[PDB]
Structure formats: structure tokens, C-alpha cells
Design a protein around this nucleic acid. Structure first.
Ligand SMILES: [Mg+2]
Ligand SMILES: [Mg+2]
Ligand SMILES: [Mg+2]
Ligand SMILES: [Mg+2]
Ligand SMILES: [Mg+2]
Ligand SMILES: [Mg+2]
Ligand SMILES: [Mg+2]
Ligand SMILES: [Mg+2]
Ligand SMILES: [Mg+2]
Ligand SMILES: [Mg+2]
Ligand SMILES: [Mg+2]
Ligand SMILES: [Mg+2]
Lengths: 65, 188, 127, 36
RNA sequence: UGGAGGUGAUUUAAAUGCCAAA
RNA sequence: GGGACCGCCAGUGGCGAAGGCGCCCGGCUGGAACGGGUCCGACGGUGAGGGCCGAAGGCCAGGGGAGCGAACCGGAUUAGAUACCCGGGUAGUCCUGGCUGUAAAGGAUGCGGGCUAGGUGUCGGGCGAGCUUCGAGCUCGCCCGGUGCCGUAGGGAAGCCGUUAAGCCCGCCGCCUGGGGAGUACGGCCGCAAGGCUGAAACUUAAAGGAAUUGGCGGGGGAGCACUACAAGGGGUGGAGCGUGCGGU
């Protein structure tokens, strides 16, 4: 109902139709799967050290080249 | 109303056949005990006797009689895991197969599939010779042994070892297996 | 003791079916398909629909006393495609996350030894 | 018919297969009128 | 370095060429 | 219960005159390579007329019919859609006895003989040497016959071919003579039919055809770039009245 914070640890690359989406690796900070590292797609400027609020932590983005 | 129908089911315990030890292998639900007949369960040889080598051998047991809450089974067939035999067949080798219909000493009808993998490509006449050797060994074993002893030797690997030792004289081998067994009939 | 069942997973390019039965396969515990959790025909084979269906099936199985399952996953096979769709792996992962133990995993796609003739003529679909 | 593989080339003409079909259709009609 | 084969696939719709050059 | 088909191993690997031939065991049968101080003694090459074999499809009788699927019946797409896509579906595809004799049936290269640098893979047989778990096993070298690649002299318009010749020489048969009309008309033979083989003229035309070069283009591939491109944004024009320029009247 409030989501789970995750911390960005690595930048992979740009993607999307018009280069608007970035793929990152994040580490869960709270919840059932705290400590796991998964990759995600993010819209907007982002840098290492930012914190995202995920609404669910079971979907993983498909790897890009 | 549906969960009402689920409450009418009772659980029955399934046992392995007599010559495998007769150990418990699982449980199954049913409302009428007559409906449990002819059900089939598949278990690996590692579960019967614990050893991490024979985890790719699969045995099928079929329920034939129910008494109380217990179900007793018979041997029906054996097979090797598909992913296992799929990793044996490679290019620049030769695969030799033989399928035989046999009758054991005590009047059991069986169909047996054996397989041999050669180290390299070989000529077809050598394949025929190896297949003939396999046939002779299997016929002799079937004539000599009873049903239970034959099944135990086939699943343990004695027959394959004898086949490999005899067939080394035609060409060096890499593997030799009894690939599949199915029972067809039983004595009257 | 331990009640173990079997999870049959049917995965194609158009849908996904998850079917939990008992150890012998003759009694059905639960059954859920992609068309029972989504509204758009386009979303039936998506991984997310597979996750939802797997969660529903796992909950229904857990409430009835099942502890773990062995997995059998198949593509349509036969004269159709031999490759499972995108929802198989998502279905497998969701079952474990819901609380069920996982036994052995194998694929049981039916493969012909030169069987029958497929559709499309000798030129195939021309799109 | 006799073979003229030069006719199969597609530059500046229609397909030879259908020309052959059209000629065969035309020859049927003459044959029918001849039998009358 | 350069070649020859085989098996898979390949996300809606989208026709035409006037005036002029003379 | 039923009808069709034999996956991986499988290999510019094998066999056959070509068309073609792939589950296993048994019977009958054709051809070729290698080894040969065996036998006969020029018995040979090509082959007009003539004969036999010949993918798929089609036809004539009798069976069979799972899957697929001309014609056809419906659902869509579209300006229309007699189509491409989707759901069904008759003949046919399969077996027994005949007929038809056609393919980009292509190695687009007729067959026999002698000769003209090398290098390197692979299949069958034989010989020599060395290993070996003693295996109808393994490795290396040479001879003969098949099957691929790179290449010297020579050949060719070039692409390329090059002891598996499209090179130099000794033979025999078949075919061609600018593009269309036309593989048509008329006549003849063959076939149940569908069709097969043979095959002109009047007239018309300045090119048709081949190999390679430079560009331009592609609802082909790869790399890069732009607020007169997009994506994230800020402000607008298109509706009203008026200023000014253009078409028309
Ligand atoms: Mg649906
Ligand atoms: Mg159709
Ligand atoms: Mg289209
Ligand atoms: Mg020509
Ligand atoms: Mg002759
Ligand atoms: Mg051919
Ligand atoms: Mg050679
Ligand atoms: Mg060369
Ligand atoms: Mg005539
Ligand atoms: Mg612009
Ligand atoms: Mg924009
Ligand atoms: Mg305005």
C-alpha cells in the first residue's frame, strides 16, 4: 500500500522507442526480499545513489544489450 | 457446495511393489476406494534406494488392490530421463538401438529397448554385429532368469555392463544402457 | 506425512494454463488459465498473467494441504511449435514465491519421430 | 509444346505460363467448331 | 583472410505520374 | 480403434544410366572398386531408323480415407479484394491392374582414348612402419578408384574453368544461323480424354541478347548527425474584427 524503497547501484543503458527510458540495477532496502538485486526500467533522469519506491518487487525488466 | 464435495474424499497410502522393498511412496485422494484401481505413479530409483548416481531412472507402479487405507502396486515399466539420453547423442559418434520381445522363465511378456554409443563413426556392418551381440545376450538372460531377477538386473546395470564387455571386441564404446522396459502380459 | 502434487504447465503463444493435480494425476486440485485473470486477448500469454494465475492456483492448492509439487512444462508440440511461450518461467517462479516447495523440473513436450503434415501448404504463411 | 527458355524472361512481357494457358484455351474452341 | 551449404523465423494499411522538355 | 510417416545420429558423406533411394530382423537379386606371372585373344567406339526406363499432376476400373487440402461455403482487410490472413471443406494425396510420356527432368556442360606444375581435406580396397585396453582398435607414409577446395601453363567477352578442363590432339552422332508472327495455321501419326511428336507463310521490326563499370534508388543491412527532426517542456497559429501581400472576378 506504500511501496518499498530501493537503491540504485548501477546504470546499464538507455532504451525505449525514443531513448526516454534507462535500465538500472537496484537493491531492495525493505520488505520480504530485502537485500536482493534486480534490474528495472526508469523514466526520468537518474544517477547512482537515488532511491525509488517500487509498488511491487516481483517483476524484472528484460535484459538489454 | 463444491467444498462440500471435497470433504467426502479420503486419502490412501501407496506402497512400492514387493521386490522393491514395499516402502511408502505417496498419498492420493478419492471418495470411493474402487476408483483408486489402475492408477499409475512414477518414482525415481534414487528415492527407493538413496544414491545420487541413479537419479535419472524412472519406474512406473500401477495400483492393483486396495485394502483399508492402503494401496498396493505392480511393476509396469521403466524409462530413462529424456534430458539424460539427449546429452549422450553427439555428432561424430554412432548410436545403436535394438528393440526385442522376450518371454521370461515364468511366462512374462516384455519389450526391451537397449542403446549403445560408439566412440566414433563406424561402418554399418559393425552396427549389425553389435546389435546381434545385444540380442544374443538379452535372449540368454531372459531364458535364464525369472521376472523379478530380470527387472532388478536390468535396472541395476549388470546387463549393460555385460553387453559392453562383450561388444568391446567389435569397437570401443562410450556408454551402454537398457533404455526402456515395458511389460505386455502376465502369466495366466 | 507429506502431500506432494504435480503442476502441469501448458505454454503457447496465445495462452497459458496452470493445472495442479495430485501425485497420480487422476485428481484435479486447481486449474487456472490466462483468460481468467485479464480482460484483453492480447495480454493472455504475458508473463504478468502467468504470475497472477500461478498465485491463484498456488493459494487454492495450499488451502487443501498440498506442500510441494513436481513441475511438468510443455509447449503445444506435435505438428505445431516445439518451443514454450514466454509465460513458462514466470509461472515457475511464482509458484515457489507463493510458498510451495519445488521438486524436480522437466519438460514433456510431445515430439514426433516424423509424424504428420503441418498446415500452411508447401509455402507456409505468406505475410 | 517446344521449349523456348528465352520466353521465360520477364522483361517487357507477361508470364509465359499464363500465355501457354491462354493459347491452350484458344485451341480448344477451334477444335470444337471443327468437329461440327 | 576468404568462400560454399542447411534449418528457422521476418508486427496493420500505402494506388498513380500529370503538367514541361517540344 | 484407425490411416499416413520413419526424428536426433546425418557428414560439398554413400549407391544408382537418369528419374530417384534413410526404423529393425529374414529370403531372393543387379552393378561397381581393390588384390591377381589365372582364362579368351581385338571379340572395340559412336550410333540414322528401332526398343526399354522415366518426379509431380491427370484419366480408366476396384479398395481405403487419419492429417493436409484445388473447386466451394463462411469471417475479416480494402475505394473495390473474384487474393494474400482466419474457421470449415470435395477431388487428390495411400494400396492393387492399366493408360498418359511431361519439368529450371539443370552440372543450363553428349560419349570413348592419349598427353600437360603443385598443395590440402574426405570415402572404399591394398601395402609398410609404430602403438595398443589385443578390438572388425588408433596414428603416420605410399599405390589405385570415387568425392570437395585453393592454384601454375594455357583458354575466354568477361564471370570464370584449370588432370573431375570450358587446355593441346585422334573419332562418331545430335542441334543452331538477327528480333517477332510462332511453337501458331494446314497436313500426318499416337492417345479413352487431357494432350504428345513433326511444323511453315504473308506481314512487321533496328535492334533483341550477354558479361562487367560509375552513379541514383530500395516498404535491404551497418555507422553517424540535426529543436527549419523527435522525445521532456514554455509559448502559440487554425475560430472573431482589422493591417498588409497573393489567386480569382
Ligand atoms: Mg481467453
Ligand atoms: Mg485454408
Ligand atoms: Mg500485406
Ligand atoms: Mg539460350
Ligand atoms: Mg549405342
Ligand atoms: Mg533434379
Ligand atoms: Mg581424386
Ligand atoms: Mg582454380
Ligand atoms: Mg492436326
Ligand atoms: Mg518542421
Ligand atoms: Mg514533442
Ligand atoms: Mg485566425
Amino acid at each position: 500500500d506504500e511501496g518499498y524503497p530501493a537503491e540504485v547501484i548501477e546504470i546499464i543503458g538507455r532504451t525505449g522507442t525514443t531513448g526516454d527510458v534507462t535500465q538500472v540495477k537496484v537493491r531492495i532496502l525493505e520488505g520480504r526480499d530485502k537485500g536482493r538485486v534486480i534490474r528495472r526500467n526508469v523514466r526520468g533522469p537518474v544517477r547512482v545513489g537515488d532511491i525509488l519506491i517500487l509498488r511491487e518487487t516481483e517483476r524484472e525488466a528484460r535484459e538489454i544489450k | 457446495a463444491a467444498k462440500d464435495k471435497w470433504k467426502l474424499k479420503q486419502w490412501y497410502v501407496i506402497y512400492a511393489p514387493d521386490f522393491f522393498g514395499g516402502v511408502e511412496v505417496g498419498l492420493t485422494p478419492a471418495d470411493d476406494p474402487e476408483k483408486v484401481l489402475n492408477r499409475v505413479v512414477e518414482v525415481t530409483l534414487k528415492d527407493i534406494t538413496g544414491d545420487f548416481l541413479k537419479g535419472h531412472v524412472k519406474l512406473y507402479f500401477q495400483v492393483y488392490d486396495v485394502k483399508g487405507q492402503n494401496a498396493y502396486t505392480k511393476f509396469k515399466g521403466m524409462k530413462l530421463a529424456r534430458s539424460y539420453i539427449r546429452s549422450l547423442v553427439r555428432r561424430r559418434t554412432t548410436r545403436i538401438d535394438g528393440i526385442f520381445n522376450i518371454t521370461t522363465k515364468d511366462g512374462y511378456k516384455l519389450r526391451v529397448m537397449a542403446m549403445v554409443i560408439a566412440a566414433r563413426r563406424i561402418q554399418t556392418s559393425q552396427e549389425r554385429a553389435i546389435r546381434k551381440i545385444m540380442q544374443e545376450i538379452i535372449y540368454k538372460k531372459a531364458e535364464e532368469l525369472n521376472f523379478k531377477d530380470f527387472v532388478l538386473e536390468a535396472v541395476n546395470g549388470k546387463i549393460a555392463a555385460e553387453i559392453a564387455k562383450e561388444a568391446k571386441k567389435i569397437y570401443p564404446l562410450k556408454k551402454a544402457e537398457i533404455r526402456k522396459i515395458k511389460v505386455l502380459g502376465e502369466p495366466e | 506425512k507429506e502431500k506432494w502434487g504435480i503442476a502441469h504447465i501448458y505454454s503457447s503463444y496465445n495462452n497459458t494454463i496452470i493445472h495442479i493435480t495430485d501425485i497420480t494425476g487422476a485428481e484435479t486440485i486447481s486449474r487456472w488459465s490466462g483468460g481468467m485473470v485479464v480482460k484483453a486477448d492480447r495480454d493472455e500469454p504475458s508473463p504478468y498473467a502467468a504470475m497472477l494465475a500461478a498465485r491463484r492456483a498456488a493459494e487454492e492448492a495450499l488451502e487443501k494441504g498440498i506442500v510441494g509439487v513436481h513441475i511438468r512444462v510443455r509447449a503445444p508440440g506435435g505438428s505445431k511449435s516445439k518451443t514454450p511461450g514466454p509465460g513458462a518461467q514466470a509461472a515457475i517462479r511464482a509458484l515457489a514465491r507463493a510458498g510451495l516447495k519445488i521438486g524436480r523440473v522437466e519438460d514433456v513436450t510431445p515430439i514426433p519421430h516424423d509424424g504428420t503434415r503441418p498446415k500452411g501448404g508447401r509455402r507456409g504463411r505468406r505475410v | 509444346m517446344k521449349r523456348r527458355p528465352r520466353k521465360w524472361k520477364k522483361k517487357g512481357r507477361m508470364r509465359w505460363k499464363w500465355i501457354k494457358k491462354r493459347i491452350r484455351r484458344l485451341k480448344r474452341q477451334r477444335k470444337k467448331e471443327r468437329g461440327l
